[PDB]
């Protein structure tokens, strides 16, 4: 359309103030994705979302939704509920699984994108929060990290307040040790219901320059545990 048609030989993209606003955030069309097109796409505020059959499509929307940890909403029900948690959370033990539980749920997570998230995984950048009943894998989430700055991905549920477990316990893991933001990209009533809000795509990217450029500590993503029942 009026999109710019991405190169299959280098990872640039054009400027995210420059996206169509409709749809909304609309920017890029096409490339590939390798994980140093997509490590820049993320840096620079851009994400990959298409359907099925569909070119990839680079998007970075106005305003952009986004969870201040610190303001993660949790019901009194689930403050009850985690007291006498039944679940073991950890991280980046079973990526694969996770995307695998998201993608089963998460229509526009196909083999090519499983691919490429595991592929980001395996380089260190991409990350899974998994919940477990015993030993059985029950709900968890993923993202990519941008140093304080932590973009969502998807998250799924097989038992009750599973992908809600992840979350609050992510979030108390990551702001205790210096993490700043959580990237929503689109708002939806299930996480505003979490306490997600809107903020100018201006104030987003400000936030990113900066925040990308921040560390959590060295081992904060190393494979461990973060609760036990």
Not at 56 to 68: C, E, Q
Not at 162 to 182: D, M, P, R
């Amino acid at each position: 359309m009026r999109l710019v048609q991405l190169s299959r030989h280098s990872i640039a993209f054009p400027s995210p103030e420059g996206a169509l606003r409709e749809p909304n955030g609309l920017l890029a069309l096409g490339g590939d994705l390798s994980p140093a097109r997509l490590l820049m796409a993320y840096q620079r505020g851009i994400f990959p979302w298409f359907s099925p059959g569909d070119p990839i499509l680079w998007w970075s929307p106005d305003p952009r939704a986004v969870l201040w940890p610190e303001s993660l909403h949790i019901s009194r029900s689930m403050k009850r509920f985690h007291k006498r948690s039944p679940y073991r959370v950890t991280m980046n033990y079973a990526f694969g699984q996770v995307i695998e539980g998201c993608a089963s749920d998460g229509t526009w997570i196909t083999r090519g994108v499983v691919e490429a998230y595991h592929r980001l995984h395996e380089l260190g950048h991409a990350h899974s929060i998994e919940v477990w009943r015993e030993d059985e894998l029950v709900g968890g989430m993923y993202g990519v990290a941008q140093g304080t700055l932590f973009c969502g991905e998807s998250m799924f549920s097989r038992m009750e307040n599973a992908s809600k477990t992840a979350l609050l316990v992510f979030c108390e893991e990551f702001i205790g040790h210096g993490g700043k933001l959580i990237d929503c990209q689109v708002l939806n009533d299930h996480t505003a219901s979490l306490g997600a809000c809107e903020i100018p795509r201006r104030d987003y990217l400000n936030y990113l320059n900066q925040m990308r450029l921040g560390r959590l500590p060295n081992n904060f993503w190393v494979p461990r545990c973060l609760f036990s029942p």
